[PDB]
Amino acid sequence: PHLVIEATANLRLETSPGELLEQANKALFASGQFGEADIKSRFVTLEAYRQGTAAVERAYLHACLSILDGRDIATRTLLGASLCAVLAEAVAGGGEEGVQVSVEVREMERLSYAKRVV
Amino acid sequence: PHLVIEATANLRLETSPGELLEQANKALFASGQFGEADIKSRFVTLEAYRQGTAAVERAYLHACLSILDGRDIATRTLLGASLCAVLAEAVAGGGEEGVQVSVEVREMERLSYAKRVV
Amino acid sequence: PHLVIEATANLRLETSPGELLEQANKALFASGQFGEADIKSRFVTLEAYRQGTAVERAYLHACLSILDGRDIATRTLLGASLCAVLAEAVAGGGEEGVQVSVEVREMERLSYAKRVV
Amino acid sequence: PHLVIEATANLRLETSPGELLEQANKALFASGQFGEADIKSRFVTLEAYRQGTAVERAYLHACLSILDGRDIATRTLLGASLCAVLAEAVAGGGEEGVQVSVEVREMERLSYAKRVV
Amino acid sequence: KDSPIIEANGTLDELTSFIGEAKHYVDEEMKGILEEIQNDIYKIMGEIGSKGKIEGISEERIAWLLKLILRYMEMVNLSFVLPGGTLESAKLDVCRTIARRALRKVLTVTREFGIGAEAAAYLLALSDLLFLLARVIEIELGKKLLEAARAGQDDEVRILMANGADVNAHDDQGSTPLHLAAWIGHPEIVEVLLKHGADVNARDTDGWTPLHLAADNGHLEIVEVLLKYGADVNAQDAYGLTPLHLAADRGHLEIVEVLLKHGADVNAQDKFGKTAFDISIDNGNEDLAEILQ
Amino acid sequence: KDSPIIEANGTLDELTSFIGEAKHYVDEEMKGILEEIQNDIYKIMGEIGSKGKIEGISEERIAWLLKLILRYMEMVNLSFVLPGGTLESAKLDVCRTIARRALRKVLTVTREFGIGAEAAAYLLALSDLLFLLARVIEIELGKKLLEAARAGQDDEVRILMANGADVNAHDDQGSTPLHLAAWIGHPEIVEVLLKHGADVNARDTDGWTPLHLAADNGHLEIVEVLLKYGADVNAQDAYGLTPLHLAADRGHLEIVEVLLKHGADVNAQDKFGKTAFDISIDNGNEDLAEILQ
């Protein structure tokens, strides 16, 4: 699976981007759904961003988990909640108000999926 | 909702990335579909890019709007058209020809979607 | 079509990201599924990444986004085509084999917006 | 497969029952439907029999039992094939023409039991 | 034994049978390629017939097709043409259409059973390769007809077109078998090509028609023939020259006479400003100047 | 006029056309057989098109196929082969696959209309007969290539192989066209067969390769060629003899020299315990014993 975590530049974490990615990968592996070596995650800092239309400064954290199709709703729902726990705990602050943390889980088409090892 | 705007480095805008994101958020809020504080957008400049295979200088501008499912085709279509108009106006030029401006609108699975507030 | 290629910073290519994008666009155009001028790709180097939890590891993943209307054979062939091109472009990275993968997804045509400025 | 051949005692054969069974097994194997070692046939002479109610009459009938999974053409062809072998094996018997017939039936595969001792 | 499975296998069986025929009309390279394809088709049938229980063709087989496609793709530079330009290419076009029917059957199985997607992609790539192979064959007969015309072999020329070679094929320089006969000086070849639809006014990369070639090189008999079949006596090349300006400058008076009889304009100016008459004057050719005025 | 009926008839009609083509590529016997089949297919269409109102083929027609099948079945002794080994057999493989498509259509009609079961059995047997007939043709081209090699005709062998003959076909004795060229003594042939893929180390029923044959029969030129294309200079037959043991025992010194230069082991023992050197000693051959030690 592939996980992307995006945070606003003004968002303060309790840990490094690397530690968050490691914790996220552990949370994913602990599901029993994934092989350890197959979990690929990356973290991006957002420098050009806007939340809403008001002048208030805001911070946010968003992730999307990409998996091959075949898992049910409870699994996808639990994976989302699981990552949210990991992400939310890593947030120290940022902006003038509470930080929104969200996770999507989406499915890739298995049939058209291509993979090689080099 | 989440909006991503990607522009080639050789693409010239009439306004700053910030102004475009603000205008984009206003365009989304004006739809009546969204809470003001929930609209989260970011802008990315692309440094490594190619359009086509011909040795011609080209610039492009693309956005993808991600929303939770539940809106009809007219709404998604209008949202796309709305953003494309905003983005198109912000384009000054780039490359040796016309600049392609496009917008995708996609739906996120509501049932598996997870959110936290820190 | 919109193609995004993401590689770990520790991943070594045989060619430059630019050359890879050109090859990818050629692979797409050679499918006969696309207009030449419409094929838009970008490449990104990942600086903050982890693979697994235990190790020096590199990876390469691409996502091809197309308007809906193509069948399974077409999407499957497009994925395999790109994966072959990308896989061959990998010179190394990490202390073990490099995973190279491609996904193909469809965009909703009806809500799709486009203009040329 | 299991093939049974029953003939009236007054029925005259061109060859011995043994030859008939070997030819029958070859005819079955030639279908390409069966393993050589799988084909089991036996021949029986009927000593107590009547045909009709009015006469010296002979008859020859076989029943082929196979596991289900074959189509109509296969079962039909197997029957016709066996009838050809069987018909040619008849030299006479009774005071009239000899009826030669073959039925093909299917055994339920799921409940079928087999071992080799 | 669900019908989609049986029909897919049956159609693939039909496909490899036609391929088995086609490989007897192709060269050694294509023959070997088709045999590997027959092996892949068999491999695919193993997967389909077993409902995905048996592994089918590998991604390397798809890439194998793609490499061949990339090779032959750069050899093909299509206008639209009708299937079966040559007897040999017809065999491949037939295989192509069967392969497409095979694809539809296998794709149906994939949609209903969730297996064979790689095989379907393979068959899709196969159809593309088969298309190219047919076109390459037609291009190659084209090149052999060009060779015949350049060599001056009147029988080869008739034979090549009888077997499907395009009389309007052209080399990298834009010259068709008709330009080649006009330049070299083989009237019999010029004639049979015109007879079977060669474009008497085709332009090469220098803007020249077969008439410019014949007029410039003193080929009087060919000039007459080209005009009979509708050559544009006043066709201008890239620089504005007509076959008359070329015949004039070379001093080919008998050709000048023929050109003028068919409406050649002695007063036409090229892009430099020179007319055929002014040229006879610049070269000091008193007799030509008499013919051109 | 229900579709299953129309499609069954149309497909059988399509089948007859391919048969009509194929019978122009076969000998008089198979031609006559195919014509009888065309009549049967027409007879079958009569039954289907009339929904069983018109009688179809009789049981004698099914038996008629079966007799031909039994005859040709003993001529066919399959490894797996690709469809269309020869141009001629390809034509029948095409008819075979079409016949199977015809069968599927008729089976559909039978299930829905309750008619044509005998016709379906006939068509099933037909596809089996067509398979065999195609294989027999390939076997026969095989046999003609064996003859060509035995005769020593370099043109025949190229022609037979060009038309699809199996370069590795063999006779009842296991000898391939390559063994025949090595045994008879035609250097031109042993070379062209190797060139077209003959297995240089194929074994006949005595365990012999073409090199064993050449070494034993004094064919010096043949030995040189076989080794160049990868013959196993130390291959042992059923009795443990190498080509060196055979050349030594026959006193063929020039061959012994060639074999030794390519790594033949003079100290190898056959199953009796004899080495090539000990043999030169047993025969009192002072010159052979020298080259072997």
Side-chain angles (χ1 to χ4, degrees):
Chain A
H2 298 261
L3 177 66
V4 57
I5 301 170
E6 296 180 354
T8 56
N10 65 341
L11 191 152
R12 186 177 67 253
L13 300 175
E14 295 294 351
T15 70
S16 69
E19 290 175 297
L20 179 59
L21 291 169
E22 291 176 355
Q23 290 177 2
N25 287 358
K26 290 176 182 178
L28 291 172
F29 182 76
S31 70
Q33 298 299 307
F34 302 118
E36 184 269 340
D38 291 330
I39 300 170
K40 280 82 74 178
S41 64
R42 71 276 197 189
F43 180 101
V44 178
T45 299
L46 302 176
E47 298 292 346
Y49 61 91
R50 291 290 186 277
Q51 182 173 355
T53 62
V56 66
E57 184 179 331
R58 292 161 168 148
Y60 63 82
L61 177 65
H62 175 71
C64 181
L65 176 66
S66 174
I67 64 171
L68 294 173
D69 65 273
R71 273 68 174 176
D72 65 10
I73 293 168
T75 300
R76 292 195 298 277
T77 302
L78 184 59
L79 289 168
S82 179
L83 290 172
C84 289
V86 172
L87 268 58
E89 290 179 354
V91 177
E96 297 179 84
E97 61 183 29
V99 178
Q100 292 188 1
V101 179
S102 64
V103 178
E104 179 185 1
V105 180
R106 66 180 178 88
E107 295 181 295
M108 297 178 284
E109 180 177 55
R110 185 177 296 275
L111 291 173
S112 65
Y113 180 76
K115 180 171 71 172
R116 294 178 184 271
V117 179
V118 178
Chain B
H2 298 261
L3 177 66
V4 298
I5 301 170
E6 296 180 354
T8 57
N10 65 341
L11 191 152
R12 292 181 292 106
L13 300 175
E14 294 296 350
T15 69
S16 70
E19 289 176 297
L20 178 59
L21 291 168
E22 290 176 356
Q23 185 64 52
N25 288 358
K26 291 176 182 178
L28 291 172
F29 184 54
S31 71
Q33 297 299 307
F34 303 118
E36 181 273 331
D38 293 331
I39 300 170
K40 299 171 280 295
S41 64
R42 62 87 178 271
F43 179 101
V44 178
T45 299
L46 302 176
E47 299 294 341
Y49 58 90
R50 292 290 187 277
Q51 182 177 339
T53 62
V56 296
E57 293 290 324
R58 284 164 168 162
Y60 62 83
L61 175 64
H62 176 71
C64 181
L65 177 67
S66 294
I67 64 171
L68 294 174
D69 65 273
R71 273 69 174 176
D72 66 11
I73 293 168
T75 301
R76 292 196 298 277
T77 302
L78 182 60
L79 289 168
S82 179
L83 290 172
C84 185
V86 171
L87 268 58
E89 290 178 354
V91 174
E96 64 182 88
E97 62 182 28
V99 178
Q100 295 181 3
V101 179
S102 64
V103 179
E104 180 185 2
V105 180
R106 61 182 290 272
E107 295 181 296
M108 297 179 286
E109 182 178 51
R110 185 177 296 276
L111 291 172
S112 66
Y113 179 77
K115 183 176 180 180
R116 299 290 185 273
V117 179
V118 178
Chain C
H2 298 260
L3 176 66
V4 57
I5 302 170
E6 296 180 354
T8 55
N10 64 5
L11 190 151
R12 186 179 65 188
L13 300 176
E14 292 296 350
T15 68
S16 70
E19 290 173 296
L20 179 60
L21 291 168
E22 291 176 356
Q23 290 176 32
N25 287 358
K26 290 176 182 178
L28 290 171
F29 185 54
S31 70
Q33 299 298 306
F34 301 118
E36 184 274 333
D38 291 313
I39 299 170
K40 298 172 282 295
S41 64
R42 70 277 197 189
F43 179 101
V44 178
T45 300
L46 301 176
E47 300 294 339
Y49 61 90
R50 292 289 187 276
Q51 182 177 339
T53 63
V55 177
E56 292 290 324
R57 285 163 170 161
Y59 62 83
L60 177 63
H61 179 72
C63 180
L64 176 65
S65 296
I66 63 171
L67 294 174
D68 65 273
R70 274 68 174 175
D71 66 10
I72 294 168
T74 300
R75 292 195 297 277
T76 301
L77 182 59
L78 289 169
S81 179
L82 290 172
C83 186
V85 170
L86 268 59
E88 291 179 354
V90 176
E95 63 181 298
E96 62 182 29
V98 178
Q99 294 183 333
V100 181
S101 60
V102 180
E103 65 175 301
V104 180
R105 68 181 184 87
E106 295 181 295
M107 300 180 286
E108 181 178 57
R109 186 176 297 275
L110 291 173
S111 65
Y112 183 78
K114 184 177 180 181
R115 297 183 181 180
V116 178
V117 178
Chain D
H2 296 261
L3 177 66
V4 299
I5 301 167
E6 296 180 354
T8 55
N10 65 7
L11 190 151
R12 187 179 65 189
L13 300 176
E14 291 294 349
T15 66
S16 68
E19 181 66 21
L20 271 59
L21 293 168
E22 290 176 21
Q23 291 179 4
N25 288 358
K26 290 176 182 178
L28 291 172
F29 184 76
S31 70
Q33 299 298 307
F34 301 118
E36 184 274 332
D38 296 314
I39 300 169
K40 280 83 72 177
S41 298
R42 63 87 179 272
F43 179 101
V44 178
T45 299
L46 301 176
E47 298 293 347
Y49 59 90
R50 292 289 186 276
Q51 182 177 339
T53 63
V55 177
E56 293 290 324
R57 285 163 172 163
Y59 61 82
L60 177 63
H61 179 72
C63 180
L64 177 65
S65 295
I66 63 171
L67 294 174
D68 65 273
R70 273 68 174 175
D71 66 10
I72 293 169
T74 300
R75 293 195 297 277
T76 302
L77 183 59
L78 288 169
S81 179
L82 290 172
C83 289
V85 172
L86 293 170
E88 291 179 354
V90 177
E95 61 181 298
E96 62 177 57
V98 178
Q99 294 182 2
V100 180
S101 61
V102 179
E103 64 176 300
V104 180
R105 58 180 292 270
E106 295 181 295
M107 300 179 286
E108 181 178 56
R109 186 175 296 275
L110 291 173
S111 64
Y112 183 78
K114 182 171 71 174
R115 298 182 181 180
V116 179
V117 178
Chain E
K1 295 184 181 182
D2 291 316
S3 294
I5 299 299
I6 294 165
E7 290 177 354
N9 287 335
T11 305
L12 288 169
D13 191 16
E14 186 170 351
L15 176 62
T16 183
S17 180
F18 283 121
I19 290 168
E21 181 178 358
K23 69 181 181 181
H24 294 287
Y25 296 96
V26 301
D27 65 12
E28 296 79 3
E29 290 177 52
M30 290 180 183
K31 182 177 179 180
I33 291 167
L34 294 172
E35 289 177 352
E36 289 179 52
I37 291 168
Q38 287 187 291
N39 286 335
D40 289 322
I41 292 167
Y42 179 78
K43 182 67 174 178
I44 290 168
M45 290 175 70
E47 181 182 359
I48 293 168
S50 63
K51 299 183 181 179
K53 289 179 180 178
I54 298 170
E55 184 178 359
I57 58 93
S58 69
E59 295 81 0
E60 294 83 0
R61 303 312 301 155
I62 293 168
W64 177 80
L65 289 172
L66 290 173
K67 289 178 181 179
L68 291 172
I69 291 167
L70 292 170
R71 182 267 186 90
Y72 288 119
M73 181 181 72
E74 295 295 322
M75 296 177 70
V76 179
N77 298 277
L78 296 172
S79 66
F80 175 78
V81 298
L82 296 176
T86 72
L87 180 61
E88 295 79 2
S89 75
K91 293 293 184 181
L92 271 296
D93 278 320
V94 170
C95 292
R96 177 185 57 77
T97 59
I98 298 298
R100 290 291 299 276
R101 175 147 56 80
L103 178 61
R104 290 197 297 275
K105 292 294 186 183
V106 172
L107 182 60
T108 298
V109 170
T110 299
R111 289 183 290 169
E112 296 295 322
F113 296 73
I115 60 91
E118 293 80 1
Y122 177 101
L123 292 173
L124 177 61
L126 176 61
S127 180
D128 288 344
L129 179 60
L130 292 168
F131 177 79
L132 289 172
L133 290 171
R135 305 285 80 73
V136 169
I137 291 167
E138 294 167 1
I139 294 297
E140 290 177 354
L141 270 296
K143 289 179 180 178
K144 290 179 180 178
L145 182 60
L146 288 168
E147 289 176 354
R150 187 178 297 108
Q153 297 296 306
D154 56 359
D155 289 343
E156 289 177 354
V157 169
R158 184 173 61 253
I159 290 165
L160 264 299
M161 70 176 72
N163 292 330
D166 185 352
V167 298
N168 289 302
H170 64 78
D171 66 9
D172 55 304
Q173 301 300 305
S175 296
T176 65
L178 181 60
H179 286 99
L180 290 171
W183 182 242
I184 298 300
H186 297 287
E188 295 79 1
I189 293 169
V190 170
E191 289 176 354
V192 72
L193 291 170
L194 291 169
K195 182 177 178 180
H196 294 79
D199 183 2
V200 73
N201 292 303
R203 274 73 173 177
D204 69 6
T205 59
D206 292 318
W208 288 13
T209 64
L211 184 59
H212 285 105
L213 290 167
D216 190 56
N217 202 11
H219 293 312
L220 178 62
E221 294 81 1
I222 292 170
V223 168
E224 290 176 354
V225 171
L226 291 165
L227 292 163
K228 289 179 181 179
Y229 289 71
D232 180 349
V233 77
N234 290 303
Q236 295 181 274
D237 70 5
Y239 299 93
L241 298 174
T242 65
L244 181 60
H245 293 110
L246 293 171
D249 188 56
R250 298 285 191 184
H252 293 312
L253 271 59
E254 296 79 3
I255 290 169
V256 170
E257 289 177 354
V258 171
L259 293 169
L260 268 57
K261 289 178 180 178
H262 293 79
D265 186 352
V266 299
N267 292 305
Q269 295 180 274
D270 66 7
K271 290 180 180 178
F272 294 97
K274 299 290 185 179
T275 65
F277 178 78
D278 288 344
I279 291 167
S280 71
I281 298 299
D282 288 345
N283 290 333
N285 189 334
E286 291 177 354
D287 290 344
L288 177 60
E290 184 65 21
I291 298 301
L292 295 171
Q293 184 177 67
Chain F
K1 295 181 180 179
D2 291 316
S3 294
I5 299 299
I6 294 165
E7 290 177 354
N9 287 335
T11 302
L12 288 169
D13 186 23
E14 181 175 357
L15 177 62
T16 301
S17 294
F18 283 98
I19 292 168
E21 182 178 359
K23 70 181 181 181
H24 294 288
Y25 298 73
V26 300
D27 64 11
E28 296 80 2
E29 182 178 58
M30 290 180 183
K31 181 178 178 180
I33 291 168
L34 292 171
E35 290 177 354
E36 290 295 296
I37 291 167
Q38 288 187 301
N39 286 335
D40 289 319
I41 293 167
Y42 179 78
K43 182 67 174 178
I44 291 169
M45 290 175 70
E47 182 179 359
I48 292 168
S50 65
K51 298 183 181 179
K53 289 179 180 178
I54 298 170
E55 296 84 356
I57 58 92
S58 68
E59 294 81 0
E60 293 83 0
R61 305 314 301 154
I62 293 168
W64 178 79
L65 289 172
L66 290 172
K67 289 178 181 178
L68 292 170
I69 290 167
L70 293 170
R71 183 183 296 161
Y72 291 119
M73 180 181 72
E74 294 180 355
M75 296 176 70
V76 179
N77 298 277
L78 295 174
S79 66
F80 176 78
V81 298
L82 297 177
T86 71
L87 180 61
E88 294 80 1
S89 73
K91 293 293 183 181
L92 272 62
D93 279 322
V94 170
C95 292
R96 177 184 57 77
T97 59
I98 298 298
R100 288 287 181 87
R101 174 148 57 80
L103 178 61
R104 290 198 297 274
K105 292 293 184 181
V106 172
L107 289 171
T108 298
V109 170
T110 299
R111 288 194 296 273
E112 296 295 323
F113 297 73
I115 61 91
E118 294 80 1
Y122 177 101
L123 292 171
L124 176 62
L126 176 62
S127 71
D128 288 343
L129 179 60
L130 291 171
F131 177 79
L132 290 172
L133 289 170
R135 304 285 81 73
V136 169
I137 291 168
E138 293 168 0
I139 294 297
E140 291 177 354
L141 270 296
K143 289 179 180 178
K144 290 179 180 178
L145 182 60
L146 289 170
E147 289 176 354
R150 187 179 298 108
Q153 298 296 307
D154 59 304
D155 290 288
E156 289 177 354
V157 298
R158 287 193 295 272
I159 291 167
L160 267 298
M161 289 188 285
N163 291 330
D166 185 352
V167 74
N168 291 304
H170 63 79
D171 66 9
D172 55 304
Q173 301 300 305
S175 295
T176 65
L178 183 61
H179 286 98
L180 290 172
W183 180 60
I184 298 300
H186 296 287
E188 295 79 1
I189 302 301
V190 69
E191 289 176 354
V192 173
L193 293 170
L194 290 166
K195 182 177 178 180
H196 292 232
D199 183 1
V200 73
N201 291 303
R203 294 180 182 272
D204 69 6
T205 60
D206 293 319
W208 287 13
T209 64
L211 183 59
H212 290 105
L213 289 165
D216 196 55
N217 291 277
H219 295 310
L220 178 62
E221 294 82 1
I222 301 298
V223 169
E224 289 176 354
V225 171
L226 290 167
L227 292 168
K228 289 179 181 178
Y229 289 70
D232 180 349
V233 76
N234 289 303
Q236 295 181 274
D237 68 6
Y239 298 93
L241 277 66
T242 65
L244 184 64
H245 291 105
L246 293 170
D249 189 57
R250 297 285 191 183
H252 294 312
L253 182 62
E254 296 79 3
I255 290 169
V256 170
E257 289 176 354
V258 171
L259 293 168
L260 180 60
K261 289 179 181 178
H262 293 78
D265 186 352
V266 300
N267 292 329
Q269 295 180 274
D270 65 7
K271 291 179 180 178
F272 294 97
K274 298 291 185 179
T275 65
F277 179 78
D278 289 344
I279 291 167
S280 71
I281 298 299
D282 288 345
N283 290 333
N285 189 334
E286 291 177 354
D287 289 344
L288 178 60
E290 183 66 20
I291 275 54
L292 294 170
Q293 184 177 67

